[PDB]
Symmetry: C2
Subunit: 322 residues, 2 copies
């Protein structure tokens, strides 16, 4: 009888807007604005200065969520950050974010790793903590500086990912926002989307650059996204026709249009930011959520479906009554 | 109505047992001794993975051993949470790699959580929450580290202290409590005193990818919070410190452990101690000690176990588990 309601949203993009032309010139390896749009639907993305970290981005998005929620920062008793580019090996980004916000209440703070499905994982976890009574007000973040793990000699991937942060404040409520979530993983497909390295004795071992088999990822993606959306919708006792807004992970326009069509929704019911944001992994969904809440598309009482896939393979979905 | 019960435990140490003398001789080609390390820490040995052996490799063996103890079908595990701060890769997650190593084909959720040396408490509390609600039924919960990868062997303060290893539990929905309660906390204002302050950026390491620590500040913080969080967790499980049959702290060093135990008013013989042989294996610490003490018959069904630790963050947490 306790539910998690969205009190506020916030987001942030770092100031360097990098257009397709900017990127094509940079490599000039051969690519173009036309080629990138045809492949992905992306026109621009945003890169942090290499000096600026995931928690920096997270801080500003959180501040803006806190403002929308209109709450005392000291009332946030849980922070979960979904990221795959944390500031440090340890401690966690959430811990750094806690201190940046000046929160002194000793509340739990941790990071979760499910890559581009990270925010679904983070939402479902917070929701579970709030529903049980254990926490009351959670700050849930998706944040990435994916420019730090891009190989700019690889046009397959380096024109695809961007940086950014999005945040939501969830609070105990007698009335549902978060109705249901479904999370999944299949580690047999780890090889087709991976950044296969880490630090070892001071030096990088393996490759600390993102690699991807785009064709395999696409087929897997469309295959699971349909199923998990249905499972989630069933778990929330809702039908596809009752979805007022679809917010997929902003991977690329064609995976997004496919999913939306397979659900039988009209394309006008889907929030699309990939064109301006690119693929910001865990940040993707809460960026789009924030944009669409703040521009008045998403209204109180409406049913929102978030879903995505990511490295792992992982995938997950949530049905949220805003 | 639904509780999480421990069906089985398992653990693993890599084969290279590194004694204090082995390590002293090593840094003598670089300064320390067996006596200095024992006096400081209570440590006599620790175990190092080969540099080509990863956290998920260690996790695999510990998990298999839990699965064996649980006596369940591997395909029935519908949740995998790994606590680690030394995952195999930037991504994907260790839990995903572990899933495939175990040949689990049921598409269950798999993810990693980061709370450093408090990781296992964080992981247990998250799994517990998922099982209690009905969302998941059988969870594999891992603490696993290859902390040798982030040690500076020119720093005698820290490089004699940490080790590698993995420990695992299977939790399952039950009408009778094992996990009675958990309390988790964090204070990021103390991030600077215990940190590995770097990461990868454009192919190279930026910052320092080596663990640093202000031992004195960590100790004082540790003893201060461990007493409080134990009590909070015990209250939340409707128990008192005198109802604890076994205390299993994060195996940081013998003196923080003895302090905590005394401050709870327990005798020292009610505390499981593995630091001497395992060293500080961060998130792997508690489930290593859990496994050792379950399998040598100390921890018996029906007994109340308190697990408690602190780590980088600062983070800390506790759990009260009726075995």
């Amino acid at each position: 009888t306790i539910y998690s309601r969205v009190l506020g949203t916030g987001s942030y993009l770092p100031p360097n807007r990098v257009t397709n032309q900017d990127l094509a010139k940079r490599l000039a390896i051969e690519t173009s604005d036309e080629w990138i749009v045809a492949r992905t639907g992306i026109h621009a993305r945003y890169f942090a200065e290499p000096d600026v970290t995931t928690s920096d981005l997270a801080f500003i998005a959180s501040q803006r969520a806190i403002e929308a929620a209109d709450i005392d920062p000291q009332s946030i008793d849980l922070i979960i950050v979904a990221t795959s580019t944390p500031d440090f090996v340890f401690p966690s980004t959430a811990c750094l974010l806690q201190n940046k916000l000046g929160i002194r209440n000793h509340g739990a703070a941790f990071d979760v790793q499910a890559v581009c499905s990270g925010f679904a994982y983070a939402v479902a976890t917070a929701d579970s903590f709030i529903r049980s009574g254990q926490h009351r007000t959670a700050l849930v973040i998706g944040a990435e500086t994916f420019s730090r793990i891009l190989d700019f000699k690889d046009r397959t991937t380096c024109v695809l990912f961007g940086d950014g942060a999005g945040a939501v404040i969830l609070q105990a409520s007698d009335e549902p926002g978060v109705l249901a979530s479904a999370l999944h993983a299949d580690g047999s497909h780890s090889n087709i989307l991976c950044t296969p390295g880490n630090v070892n004795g001071g030096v990088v071992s393996g490759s600390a650059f993102l690699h991807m088999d785009g064709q395999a990822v696409f087929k897997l993606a469309v295959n699971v996204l349909e199923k998990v959306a249905v499972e989630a919708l069933e778990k929330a006792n809702l039908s596809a026709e009752q979805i007022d807004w679809l917010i997929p992970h902003q991977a690329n326009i064609r995976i997004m249009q496919s999913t939306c069509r397979k659900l039988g929704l009209p394309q006008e019911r889907m929030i699309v930011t990939v064109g301006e944001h690119g693929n910001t992994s865990a940040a993707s969904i809460p960026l789009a959520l924030d944009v669409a809440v703040r521009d008045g598309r998403i209204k109180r009482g409406q049913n929102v479906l978030i879903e995505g896939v990511g490295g792992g393979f992982t995938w997950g979905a949530s049905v949220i009554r805003y």
